[PDB]
C-alpha cells in the first residue's frame, strides 16, 4: 500500500525525535552554561574578560550535540535512507 | 521576484539597525585604539627628547 508513504512517515517521526532531543539538550546545556557565566560575572567584574573563553568552548561543545543531530534530521527528512 | 523585494527590505532593515546601534560603538573602539597608539608614539618621542 504505497510503501514510500510508510517510509516518509517513519522518516518524519525520526526527524521529530532528532529535533526534540537535540533542542532539549541544547536548551538545557546553554541555560546551564549561561547560569555559570552569570554567576561568575557576579563574583567579580574583571573575571568576565576571561570567562567568555571557556564559556564559548562549553557552548561549542553543547550546540554541537544539537546541530550534529540537526544534520541527520535533514538526511532523514529530505534524502531519506532506504526510500525505495 | 516578490521574495526578492521582501529580502531586500529585510536587508535594508538589518543595515539600518547596524548603522544605528552597532557601528557607533565599534567606531568608538577603533578611535580609542588609534588614539591610544598615537598617544603612545607621542609619549615615546617626548621621552626620547627628555
Amino acid at each position: 500500500l504505497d510503501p514510500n508513504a510508510i517510509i516518509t512517515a517513519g522518516a518524519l517521526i525520526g526527524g521529530g525525535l532528532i529535533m526534540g532531543g537535540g533542542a532539549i539538550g541544547a536548551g538545557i546545556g546553554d541555560g546551564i552554561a549561561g547560569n555559570a557565566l552569570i554567576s561568575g560575572i557576579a563574583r567579580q567584574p574583571e573575571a568576565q574578560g576571561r570567562l567568555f573563553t571557556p564559556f564559548f568552548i562549553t557552548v561549542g561543545l553543547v550546540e554541537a550535540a544539537y546541530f550534529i543531530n540537526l544534520a541527520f534530521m535533514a538526511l532523514f527528512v529530505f534524502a531519506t535512507p532506504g526510500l525505495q | 521576484m516578490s521574495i526578492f523585494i521582501g529580502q531586500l527590505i529585510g536587508f535594508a532593515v538589518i543595515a539600518f539597525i547596524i548603522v544605528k546601534w552597532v557601528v557607533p560603538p565599534v567606531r568608538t573602539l577603533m578611535r580609542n585604539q588609534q588614539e591610544a597608539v598615537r598617544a603612545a608614539l607621542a609619549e615615546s618621542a617626548e621621552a626620547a627628547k627628555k
Binding site: 544534520a71 535533514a74 538526511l75 529530505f78 534524502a79 | -
Partner: protein, 35 residues
C-alpha cells in the same frame, strides 16, 4: 543526497591552502613584528 562528500572536497581545500600562504607570509609575521 547532500551529506555525501563530493569532488569539490579537494577544490575548496586547495583554495584554503593558498589562503594560508597569504596569511603565513604577508599578514601574520608582519603583525607579530609590529606588536
Amino acid at each position: 543526497n547532500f551529506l555525501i562528500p563530493n569532488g569539490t572536497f579537494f577544490a575548496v581545500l586547495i583554495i584554503f591552502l593558498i589562503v594560508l600562504g597569504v596569511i603565513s607570509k604577508w599578514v601574520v609575521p608582519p603583525i607579530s613584528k609590529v606588536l
